[PDB]
Design an enzyme around this catalytic site. Structure first.
Site, PDB file in Angstrom:
ATOM      1  N   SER B 142     -69.252  11.734 -20.902  1.00 31.81           N
ATOM      2  CA  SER B 142     -70.088  11.651 -19.321  1.00 31.81           C
ATOM      3  C   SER B 142     -70.310  12.726 -18.855  1.00 31.81           C
ATOM      4  O   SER B 142     -69.635  13.598 -18.338  1.00 31.81           O
ATOM      5  CB  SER B 142     -69.810  10.536 -19.016  1.00 31.81           C
ATOM      6  OG  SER B 142     -70.001   9.744 -17.545  1.00 31.81           O
ATOM      7  N   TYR B 155     -62.160   7.731 -15.228  1.00 31.83           N
ATOM      8  CA  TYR B 155     -62.925   8.295 -16.103  1.00 31.83           C
ATOM      9  C   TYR B 155     -63.233   9.360 -16.317  1.00 31.83           C
ATOM     10  O   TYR B 155     -63.562  10.050 -17.643  1.00 31.83           O
ATOM     11  CB  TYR B 155     -64.364   7.217 -15.403  1.00 31.83           C
ATOM     12  CG  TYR B 155     -64.636   6.872 -17.145  1.00 31.83           C
ATOM     13  CD1 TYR B 155     -64.837   5.308 -17.328  1.00 31.83           C
ATOM     14  CD2 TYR B 155     -65.914   7.854 -16.666  1.00 31.83           C
ATOM     15  CE1 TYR B 155     -65.223   5.411 -18.614  1.00 31.83           C
ATOM     16  CE2 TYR B 155     -67.513   7.440 -17.738  1.00 31.83           C
ATOM     17  CZ  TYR B 155     -67.032   6.329 -17.952  1.00 31.83           C
ATOM     18  OH  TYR B 155     -68.035   6.055 -19.521  1.00 31.83           O
ATOM     19  N   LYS B 159     -62.899  11.301 -19.573  1.00 27.47           N
ATOM     20  CA  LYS B 159     -64.717  12.253 -20.873  1.00 27.47           C
ATOM     21  C   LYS B 159     -64.258  13.645 -20.081  1.00 27.47           C
ATOM     22  O   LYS B 159     -64.734  14.014 -21.123  1.00 27.47           O
ATOM     23  CB  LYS B 159     -65.235  11.687 -19.561  1.00 27.47           C
ATOM     24  CG  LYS B 159     -65.536  10.185 -19.775  1.00 27.47           C
ATOM     25  CD  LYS B 159     -65.419   9.787 -21.020  1.00 27.47           C
ATOM     26  CE  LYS B 159     -66.112   7.558 -21.873  1.00 27.47           C
ATOM     27  NZ  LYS B 159     -66.642   7.987 -23.224  1.00 27.47           N
TER      28      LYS B 159
END
Lengths: 237, 241
Positions: B142, B155, B159
């Site tokens: 991402s 997050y 990632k």
């Protein structure tokens, strides 16, 4: 002296890179908090060595991978000096095997400490640095999180983590002029070499010099979200 | 078809991007293990749509944050079909919040699944791939892992980690011809506001199928045999290197 009477916390400051860092942040005016995980023998040396040269250090136990231990660590720096200008997340470990052989506990301990530790202290420092409407955070990532390295799936993943974390924290905290950066050591001295264009390992004191620039130098008020490689040209860029 | 007789496993395949990758791999000819964590309904719907387009799939529940659960997941595929040609690490969650108030557990769950999951599945797939002298691994990362994002400390960290892992596991598996890459989605319609469009040069969200296609290219195209350790952004130009 740019860091009078600014206050600094350096995690895993007992030896090597951490040492030189505490040692440099001192020499530039700061009052240094010298975190350790294990034995204080190493740390108390740094503390003893800072006051010798005429600064103000002090030692604190804390396994930086544990919520309550970092709370304890951030209450103490507050208790003693009621402010924190600079945090250097630096405490980390390695457990190197090929991906096939790596045990799950060996993945977790490295992630928990190397990345989780930078989550915990960063969260703590945030609270303090927003309330001050000022501060600087410097994470020691590694060149390995940028390029990958056989036998270091854990260390590489954690450090790459450190890099991305750094960028998000930079964005959340920028509106109060707080800068959040990372410094990515190559291979520090604290068979290859054909492949380091500068042709040598790096000194601890060199990585500390960079962290000093980011912590202290007014020009660096406008640097955030960045990763700077001190790797003798190993990784461009 | 390029993956006729080859076997894929997509973790987190019951919706959005996972599903689209599932359909795309079966469309390229793969047999697809559709792993999911929670609802069998979502996952059956993926399986049935692969079946309707004349391909093959089965649904397997496994919480890929758990070592022993990935053992069952992998043994399940091996038991059904005897080989693993393609691994897609897609499983993920968000628990979004500023670092100021991010709860310890919201950080850990997101790291364990999003990052740990791929360590665990890559480890298991390595054992199988290394003895076949072949396979491809694709990790869904991402753009946020590359640029960072407010409210997604957890997050972005996870990632970004995936991306570091990818490159290491690439270096480790390369001598057997196994490739290991990442696909970094931008902002996609499905998943799994307002003035974000004026920041995307192409002026729309990506479609799930669009990420599915880049993944199919890396899993199946002969040309991709010489790509390893790479992160490919599919984000309508949102991040340029």
């Amino acid at each position: 002296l740019p860091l009078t009477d600014r206050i600094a916390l350096v995690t895993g400051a007992s030896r090597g890179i951490g040492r030189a860092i505490a040692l440099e942040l001192a020499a530039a005016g700061a009052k240094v908090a010298v975190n350790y995980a294990s034995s204080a023998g190493a740390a108390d040396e740094v503390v003893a060595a800072i006051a010798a040269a005429g600064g103000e250090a002090f030692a604190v136990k804390a396994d930086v991978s544990q919520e309550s231990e970092v709370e304890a660590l951030f209450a103490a720096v507050i208790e003693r000096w009621g402010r924190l200008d600079v945090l250097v997340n630096n405490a980390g470990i390695t457990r190197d095997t090929l991906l096939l052989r790596m045990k799950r506990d060996d993945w977790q301990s490295v992630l928990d400490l190397n990345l989780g530790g930078v989550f915990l202290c960063s969260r703590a420092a945030a609270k303090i640095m927003l309330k001050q409407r000022s501060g600087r955070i410097i994470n020691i990532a590694s060149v390995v999180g940028e390029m990958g390295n056989p036998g270091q799936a854990n260390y590489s993943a954690a450090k790459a983590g450190v890099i991305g974390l750094t960028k998000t924290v930079a964005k959340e905290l920028a509106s109060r002029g707080i800068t959040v950066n990372a410094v990515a050591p190559g291979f520090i001295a604290t068979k290859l070499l054909e492949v380091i264009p500068l042709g040598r390992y790096g000194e601890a004191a060199e990585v500390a010099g960079v962290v000093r620039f980011l912590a202290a130098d007014p020009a660096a008020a406008y640097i955030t979200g960045q990763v700077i490689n001190i790797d003798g040209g190993l990784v461009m860029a």
